[PDB]
Amino acid sequence: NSNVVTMIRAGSYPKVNPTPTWVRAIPFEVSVQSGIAFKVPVGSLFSANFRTDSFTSVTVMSVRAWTQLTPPVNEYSFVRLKPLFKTGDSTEEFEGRASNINTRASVGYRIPTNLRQNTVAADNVCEVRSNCRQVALVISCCFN
Amino acid sequence: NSNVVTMIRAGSYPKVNPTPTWVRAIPFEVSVQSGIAFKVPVGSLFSANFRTDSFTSVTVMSVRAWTQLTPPVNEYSFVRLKPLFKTGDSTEEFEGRASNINTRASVGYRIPTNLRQNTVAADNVCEVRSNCRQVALVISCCFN
Amino acid sequence: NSNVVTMIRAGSYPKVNPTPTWVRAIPFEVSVQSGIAFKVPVGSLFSANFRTDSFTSVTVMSVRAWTQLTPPVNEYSFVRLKPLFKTGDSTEEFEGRASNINTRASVGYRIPSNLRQNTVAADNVCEVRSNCRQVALVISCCFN
Amino acid sequence: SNVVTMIRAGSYPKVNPTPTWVRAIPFEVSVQSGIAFKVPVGSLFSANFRTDSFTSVTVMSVRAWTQLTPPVNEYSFVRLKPLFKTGDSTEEFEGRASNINTRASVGYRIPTNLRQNTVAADNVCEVRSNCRQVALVISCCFN
Amino acid sequence: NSNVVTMIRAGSYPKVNPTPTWVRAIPFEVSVQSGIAFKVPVGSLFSANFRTDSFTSVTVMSVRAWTQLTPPVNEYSFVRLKPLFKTGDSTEEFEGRASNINTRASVGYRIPTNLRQNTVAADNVCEVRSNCRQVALVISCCFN
Amino acid sequence: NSNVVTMIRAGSYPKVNPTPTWVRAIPFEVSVQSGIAFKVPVGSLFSANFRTDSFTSVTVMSVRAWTQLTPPVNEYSFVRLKPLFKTGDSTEEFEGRASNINTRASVGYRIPTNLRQNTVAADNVCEVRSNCRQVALVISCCFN
Amino acid sequence: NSNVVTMIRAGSYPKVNPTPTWVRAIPFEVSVQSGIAFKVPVGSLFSANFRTDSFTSVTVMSVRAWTQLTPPVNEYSFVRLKPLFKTGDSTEEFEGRASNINTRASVGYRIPTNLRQNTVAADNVCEVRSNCRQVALVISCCFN
Amino acid sequence: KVPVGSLFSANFRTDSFTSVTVMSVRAWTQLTPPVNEYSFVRLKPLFKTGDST
RNA sequence: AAAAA
RNA sequence: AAAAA
RNA sequence: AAAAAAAA
RNA sequence: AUUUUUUU
RNA sequence: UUUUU
RNA sequence: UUUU
RNA sequence: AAAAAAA
RNA sequence: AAAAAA
RNA sequence: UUUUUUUU
RNA sequence: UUUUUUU
RNA sequence: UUUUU
RNA sequence: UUUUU
Ligand SMILES: [Cl-]
Ligand SMILES: [Cl-]
Ligand SMILES: [Cl-]
Ligand SMILES: [Mg+2]
Ligand SMILES: [Mg+2]
Ligand SMILES: [Mg+2]
């Protein structure tokens, strides 16, 4: 291979874009309370802690969830997801339970292509229900 | 296969080196505080406990971590890693969380070929962040 | 190839060993007197000059010898080796002579697998006989 | 059909009333914190293993497993340092558990050149651990 | 092959048996009287002289008998075997005679799979008849 | 073929050894008593009767035994062998008997490679038991 | 292979020989004077220094020679070999000269099969002529 | 210690270069050794990120 | 899908 | 798979 | 062959 | 195809 | 070839 | 089979 | 026709 | 070759 | 792919 | 008949 | 899929 | 399946 710099015969000025797009999976936690649904805000996806504070819209592709803390005594962990959309909220409750009390509960849902539009900070991704006090979210989305 | 000593028709004196190189991965532990990142010194790789007290430089290739103690109550173990380089520190935070509260949390990162230079004891390998008070590291490196 | 750091999906904590083994070819010299057999000590292999000051035993596999100085006047260089073992010394005298007064003499022997046990510093490897006053030894062994 | 038959035996054969025996011997040893315990070979010769008639043995491999729980907040670990009469080793083959409730395991194989006999007074390996009763399984050849 | 010790990546604790079975060929001699059949006790198999004093039961597979001393004057050696069982003794007399007066007489019998149960020291294997004062026995059996 | 002397275009002085090894099969006899075991000394291998008084050590590979004299009256010849090793003696009593009173008894054993080390005159190779007063031994060994 | 002793089902007593033959290559030196031919005695082959003091005859096959010391000033080394036989000496002078003043001069000759009879110590192998004061000889022979 | 500046000289047509990427080094003994000795030579790689041993 | 490893 | 030119 | 890091 | 029986 | 299962 |  | 082999 | 999903 | 190896 | 490094 | 060719 | 070959 090359051990020194080499010359590039660059031609015309190309098409450029100083602010491109970025497909990412954003790991962040949300605080969930017993017998209560938490509307996950899209604004949690725009932050300097994920390098996405320069974005104002994002296209969510798939959401996954894991329980972040231990379940109540004598109970196993569970976590539910209800997809939310501006054109109409869903009533599905994708539930995933843990078969071991010491192990996390996990579940996720994929957003179809016909429902993959941009979402701003004031929007919400989904509702979360769990017997645990905190839920770890990993959202695969496209920032633009 | 032979049962007796046999002669070796040796020739000219060969090329020798009394202090060769060594490809190792060093297991050693560090103490971590809550909400604080601990810088892993390179001088931990040089010790008589690893037969590496004769070296002064080392070329690190990959680092991996495990939580050495139990996490706080109601928490799952996690561990983060931020690679550091003398030419420029990274801002990455490769995190690994445990799905079982009784299980370690593991994560690692690989150093590319273009960044595999030597490091002396005063240098640092990476920062570590974890809710556990100790972390076990296995640093695959090349002592020279 | 790659140009930046990449995450490693590490798993369970592996089997580690801080003090491993090491197959080495150790070069060192011995001062020999004319007509007198010099017993080469095993303690000469364990030295910080060879990065082997952390070992206490070694499994010798093959021994090779070269005359380090010029022979007496009107003579050619020669060097002999008699293998020694804690279970019974041998009487072989593997000799190598030089066909040139300016050139080194060389000879070597291989220890059979059945006789490849450990040796501590207080032991001896073999006896050397030569008309030259110094002999260079290159010993292929396995430190443990 | 399902009844006895006769064997047309020939000359008297070569016999050996006390032959060899390749075995895997499970036993446990008590270990202290921060102290290395020397495992005696004499623990392999016992009526609990049908080996009280043997006086020597050729060891091939050693494997260890912690038998009791580690200290609080700690994970289990176990180290093995091979020992030989021709020269002790300095390796510390260590194995740790990724779960506090799970044993820590590690082992080492003896090469086909250091496989000589060892009597009861001989030692096989040093053991370090944070648990108090690590268990051992040793594959060896009694003779 | 390897000249040093290697690491064994052991896993979970296996299944163990400190007291295993043993298929053996037990050689022992019994004294026989003229015109009198001798019941071979099974307890002859359990002995420290066979490394079998730790067993209390054995499954006999076959029995082979050789004459151990010389026959009377002018006669050739012979030996008979009558298998004995707890469910029902046999009346077979497997006889082997010697064609040379100076040569042992040999005979044996095999126990079928349907008759291969355990026996204790109080039981008897077979009856031995011979014109020689002593008979050697090599019993192939499974200790358990 | 050639019928006269032929010139040899010799080159450099080669590697030499005036005292090499020797793979041999050494026969001798030992006097044995009744019921008592006789430890066979290794020093019997080093004698001018076998061209071996120049060796001090030897690597034994296999031992075989025969009964050298006639057995007691009415008995058949037998001979046992128990291997001895400096690291640890064996308890195996390899035994072979004679099916003819006028015929010798024979038995032997082979030493594994891992147990093939050197033995000096002060060492013992095996024990011998027989009902005959003398035993003939043939030992395959590698003198060094 | 095997890790323990195994039984050898030996048969009848074989054919043995305590003092076998030995095909050897014997190295030794002889002093030679300038202009004088030195007869090499066969008795030099029989020595304890070669493990051959138990032989009284030998069948010589081939003889090679090397100059053991440096030649006179300005001269190159040479060495001549005139074969000798009890039935009749030869007049050949197999000579080899060195193309470097610092290197040895080598030559040799092979004895045909028809001339490979035994030779006792009182006989002579060949005459040697050289300008150096010592000559090294390697004799491939068959001691019997 | 072999200086890198020895590589920049008009005797090598290289006095216009201020930097250089070294790939391999080879050495030979230029003068005769002391009496009764054989020549030897050792090389110890040095780097700005860390000296070898 | 004979024994032990 | 072992030796001794 | 070689303990260590990896790996359908 | 390591050991102990059975094995042409 | 020579010496060894 | 002997040679360089 | 310039760096490390050319089998 | 990155980041993500299969 | 780092250190020792095996018939010019 | 191996190939890899700037005109 | 964007970027850089 | 033993016997006898
Ligand atoms: Cl260094
Ligand atoms: Cl040296
Ligand atoms: Cl030969
Ligand atoms: Mg030369
Ligand atoms: Mg335990
Ligand atoms: Mg020189």
Residue A63: in which H helix or E strand, if any? strand A58-67
Q: Is B98 helix (H, G, I), strand (E, B) or coil?
A: coil
From E51's Cα to the closest Cα of chain C, the distance in A is 30
Question: Residue C100's beta-bridge partner residues?
Answer: G103
Closest residue of chain B to D101, computed from CA coordinates: B102
Tokens of B70: 């139990």
Tokens of A129: 């229900």
Chain L bases closer than 7 A to any CB of the protein: 2-7
Closest residue of chain C to B114, computed from CA coordinates: C3
Beta-strand relationship, D135-142 and D21-28: antiparallel
Please list, residue by residue across E16-54, b when 16 or more beta carbons sit within 10 angstroms of its beta carbon and e when fewer do: eeeeeebebbbbbebebeeeeebebebebbbeeebbbeb
Q: Do chains H and C touch (3 or more CB pairs under 8 A)?
A: yes
**Is E110 close to D2, i.e. CB distance below 8 A?**
no
Closest residue of chain A to B102, computed from CA coordinates: A102
- Tokens 């100076």 correspond to what residue? E102
Q: Is H7 helix (H, G, I), strand (E, B) or coil?
A: helix
**Best residue in F12, F13, F53, F138 for a mutation probing chain G (most G CBs within 10 Å):** F13
From C100's Cα to the closest Cα of chain G, the distance in A is 4
Chain P bases closer than 7 A to any CB of the protein: 1-5
Positions 12-51 of A with beta carbon below 7 A from strand S are 14-17, 20-23
- Within chain F, what is the greatest distance between any pair of CA atoms? 70
B–F CB contacts, 8 A cutoff, strictly below: 18
Q: What is the DSSP string of C94-123?
A: EEEE-SBTTSPPEEEEE--GGG--EEETTS
From C15's Cα to the closest Cα of chain E, the distance in A is 6
Chain I bases closer than 7 A to any CB of the protein: 2-5
C–E CB contacts, 8 A cutoff, strictly below: 19
Nearest Cα to G96, choosing from G83, G84, G106, G86?
G106
- Asked if residues C99 and G66 have their Cβ atoms less than 8 Å apart, the reply is yes
- Residues 6 or more apart whose CB falls under 8 angstroms from that of G84 comprise G39, G90, G123, G124, G125, G126, G127
Question: Residue B72's beta-bridge partner residues?
Answer: none
Q: What is the DSSP string of G69-101?
A: B---TTPPPEEEEEE--TT------EEEE-SST
CB contacts of D55 in chain F (<8 Å) are: 88-89, 91
Q: Return d(Cα C23, Cα C27) in angstroms, integer.
A: 13
- Within chain H, what is the greatest distance between any pair of CA atoms? 45
Tokens of F110: 């082979």
Residue length of chain F: 144
Q: Return d(Cα C33, Cα C38) in angstroms, integer.
A: 8
From F63's Cα to the closest Cα of chain C, the distance in A is 17
Please report which ligand is nearest the Cα atom of H39: 6
Q: Return d(Cα B101, Cα A138) in angstroms, integer.
A: 19
User: What sign does the CA torsion over A129, A131, A134, A139 have?
Assistant: negative
- Asked if residues G102 and C101 have their Cβ atoms less than 8 Å apart, the reply is yes
From A8's Cα to the closest Cα of chain H, the distance in A is 21
- Asked if residues G117 and G104 have their Cβ atoms less than 8 Å apart, the reply is no
Q: Return d(Cα A51, Cα A55) in angstroms, integer.
A: 9
Tokens of E15: 């299944």
Method used to obtain the model? X-ray
Kindly list the distances between the CA atom of residue A8 and the CA atoms of A5, A14, C26, G52, H50, in Å, as whole numbers in the listed order. 10, 14, 50, 80, 33
Q: What is the DSSP string of chain F?
A: ---S-EEE---S--EE-SS--EEEEEEEEEE--SS--EEEEGGGGSSGGGT-TT-S-EEEEEEEEEE-SPPSTTBPPEEEEEE--SS------EEEE-SBTTS--EEEEE--STT--EE-TT-EEEEEEESSSEEEEEEEEEE-
Please report which ligand is nearest the Cα atom of B19: 1
Using the mean position of ligand 4's atoms as its centre, give its distance from the Cα of residue C101 in Å.
9
Rg (CA), chain F: 20
Q: Return d(Cα G75, Cα G132) in angstroms, integer.
A: 10
**How far is Cα of residue G38 from the mean position of the Cα atoms in its chain?**
15
Q: Return d(Cα A101, Cα A70) in angstroms, integer.
A: 8
Nearest Cα to B141, choosing from B50, B34, B38, B22?
B22
- For residue D19, the 8-state DSSP code is -
Tokens of E132: 């020689």
Separation of CA F95 and C1' L3 in angstroms?
18
Q: Which amino acid is at B69?
A: L
- Within chain C, what is the greatest distance between any pair of CA atoms? 70
- Asked if residues B78 and B96 have their Cβ atoms less than 8 Å apart, the reply is yes
Nearest residue to R5 (CA, C1')?
Answer: A2
Rg (CA), chain G: 20
Which own/partner pairs from H42-48 qualify as long-range (CB within 8 Å, at least 24 positions apart)?
H45/B144, H46/H1, H47/B57, H47/B117, H47/B118
Separation of CA C4 and C1' J2 in angstroms?
55
Spell out residues with C-beta < 7 A from strand L: D 7, 13, 15-16, 19-22, 141; E 23-25, 61-62, 138, 140; G 1-4, 6-7
Kindly list the distances between the CA atom of residue D7 and the CA atoms of B70, C118, E81, in Å, as whole numbers in the listed order. 68, 51, 11
Nearest Cα to G33, choosing from G138, G127, G139, G137?
G127
CB contacts of C19 in chain D (<8 Å) are: 90-92
**CB atoms inside a 10 Å sphere around CB H20:** 12
**How far is Cα of residue D89 from the mean position of the Cα atoms in its chain?**
17
Q: Do chains A and F touch (3 or more CB pairs under 8 A)?
A: no
B neighbour chains, 3+ CB pairs within 8 Å: A, C, D, F, H
**CB atoms inside a 10 Å sphere around CB E72:** 12
Closest residue of chain G to C102, computed from CA coordinates: G102
Question: Residue G67's beta-bridge partner residues?
Answer: G135
Q: Which amino acid is at F39?
A: K
Residue length of chain A: 144
Q: Which amino acid is at G101?
A: I
Of D50, D61, D63, the CB nearest to E51: D50
User: What sign does the CA torsion over A28, A31, A35, A36 have?
Assistant: negative
User: What sign does the CA torsion over A112, A114, A116, A122 have?
Assistant: negative
Domains and CATH numbers, chain F: 1-144 (2.60.120.220)
E neighbour chains, 3+ CB pairs within 8 Å: C, D, F
Separation of CA F108 and C1' I4 in angstroms?
24
User: What sign does the CA torsion over C85, C87, C93, C94 have?
Assistant: negative
- Residues 6 or more apart whose CB falls under 8 angstroms from that of F14 comprise B9, G138
Q: Return d(Cα F134, Cα F34) in angstroms, integer.
A: 11
**Best residue in C56, C59, C86 for a mutation probing chain D (most D CBs within 10 Å):** C59
From C95's Cα to the closest Cα of chain G, the distance in A is 10
Output helix, strand, coil percentages for chain G, rounded to the nearest 5.
Answer: 5, 45, 50
Q: What is the DSSP string of chain C?
A: ---S-EEE---S---B-SS--EEEEEEEEEE--TT--EEEEGGGTS-GGGT-TT-SEEEEEEEEEEE-BPPPTTB--EEEEEE--TT------EEEE-SBTTSPPEEEEE--GGG--EEETTSEEEEEEESSSEEEEEEEEEE-
Nearest residue to O3 (CA, C1')?
Answer: H23
- For residue H6, report the phi and psi dihedrals to the nearest 5 degrees: -65, -20
- Asked if residues C132 and C77 have their Cβ atoms less than 8 Å apart, the reply is yes
**CB atoms inside a 10 Å sphere around CB D35:** 10
- Asked if strand J comes closer than 7 Å to F20 Cβ, the answer is yes
Tokens of G90: 């030869």
Chain J bases closer than 7 A to any CB of the protein: 1-5
**How far is Cα of residue A68 from the mean position of the Cα atoms in its chain?**
15
- For residue D134, report the phi and psi dihedrals to the nearest 5 degrees: -45, 140
CB contacts of C125 in chain D (<8 Å) are: none
Output helix, strand, coil percentages for chain B, rounded to the nearest 5.
Answer: 5, 45, 50
Q: Return d(Cα G21, Cα A41) in angstroms, integer.
A: 98
Please report which ligand is nearest the Cα atom of G23: 3
Q: Return d(Cα B76, Cα A132) in angstroms, integer.
A: 12
- Asked if residues G53 and G122 have their Cβ atoms less than 8 Å apart, the reply is no
Bin D47: left if φ > 0, else alpha if -120 < ψ < 50, else beta.
Answer: alpha
- Residues 6 or more apart whose CB falls under 8 angstroms from that of D46 comprise D52
Q: Return d(Cα A39, Cα E89) in angstroms, integer.
A: 86
Output helix, strand, coil percentages for chain E, rounded to the nearest 5.
Answer: 5, 45, 50
- Asked if strand J comes closer than 7 Å to G36 Cβ, the answer is no
